[PDB]
Structure 1
Amino acid sequence: DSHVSSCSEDWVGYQRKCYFISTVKRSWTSAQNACSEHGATLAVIDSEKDMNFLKRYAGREEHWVGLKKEPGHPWKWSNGKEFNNWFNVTGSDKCVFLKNTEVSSMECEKNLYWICNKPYK
């Protein structure tokens, strides 16, 4: 078995996930679609480490991540885990973005950069 575990070309490995940062701005839905084309979702955040890493990786520009609120349902991560509201999401919109100094929400149809992630083994 010659396997060595890592992320693929152009993905970034941290804490057993592989991350991808977009080079263009698109709607939250288009971004989710782009992540799914590569076996990922908009980034899910499982820990304070993940959060600290994501904020730094995002840099100064707003980046969509995998957290969305539907009427009549709780906030949910793109991996199916319900969000336990362990951090605050400001604003007044359904789709979540972050940058190195903020986690907030914006109209889903707005074009923003995005970050995907996915587990690796």
Structure 2
Amino acid sequence: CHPCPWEWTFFQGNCYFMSNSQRNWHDSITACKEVGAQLVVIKSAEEQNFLQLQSSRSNRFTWMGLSDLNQEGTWQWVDGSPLLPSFKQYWNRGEPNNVGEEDCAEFSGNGWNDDKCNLAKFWICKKSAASC
């Protein structure tokens, strides 16, 4: 019994997978659903640090499951949870700036950026671990 499928990274009771290909934000959501997972929704500061380190180290621009599609300037996670005030620190300086209408959040450098949802980027899926 192992807590995560092969190639998935265990962290604090959940399993994470960073793609080796790029898709747009909606196709990224689908990709995660297809493996019984979810375009990553971040619930803790420790989790955000963990994900940002890997995005920074890999130098990969990476979708997270966060958007202000439904109402501009109101960011919501894909599980419906609202973006809490304790998460505003992570936006890069000058972001979110919605330049050219940017409605999907990404790991970019040391923090978060809003970018065009049609852009192809890597993505991270999250599902819970088995117990063993």
TM-score bracket, normalised by the shorter chain, equals 0.7 to 0.9
- How big is each residue's C-alpha offset from its partner over 1:63-97, in whole Å with a ceiling of 9 and x where there is no partner? 00111112338422122212213223423111000
* TM-score, length of structure 1 as denominator length: 0.87
* TM-score, length of structure 2 as denominator length: 0.80
What corresponds to 2:25 in structure 1? 28
Aligned pairs for 1:1-121 (under 5 A) are 4=1, 6-58=3-55, 59=57, 60-72=59-71, 74-88=74-88, 89=91, 90=95, 91-92=97-98, 93-121=102-130
Single out whichever of 83-92 and 50-59 deviates more from structure 2: 83-92
Identity %: 29
Greater fraction of residues in helix: 2
Shift of 1:102: 2.1
Equivalent-residue separation in structure 2 for 1:64 and 1:53 (angstroms): 15
Residue correspondences, number = 118
Query: CA 1:120–1:80 in 2, change beyond 3 Å: closer, same or farther?
Result: farther
| Letter matched to residue 86 of structure 1 | S
Across the aligned residues of Structure 1 and Structure 2, the Cα RMSD in angstroms comes to 1.7
| Letter matched to residue 115 of structure 1 | I
Contact 1:63 1:113 in 2 (8 A): yes
Runs of 4+ off more than 3 Å: 71-74
Instruction: Give SS of 2:87's match.
Output: coil
Equivalent-residue separation in structure 1 for 2:110 and 2:27 (angstroms): 24
Structure 2 stretches of 5 or more lacking a match? Answer: none
Structure 1 stretches of 5 or more lacking a match? Answer: none
| Letter matched to residue 66 of structure 1 | G
Shift of 1:9: 0.5
Single out whichever of 31-40 and 57-66 deviates more from structure 2: 57-66
Contact 2:17 2:125 in 1 (8 A): yes
Contact 1:68 1:77 in 2 (8 A): yes
Equivalent-residue separation in structure 2 for 1:5 and 1:76 (angstroms): 32
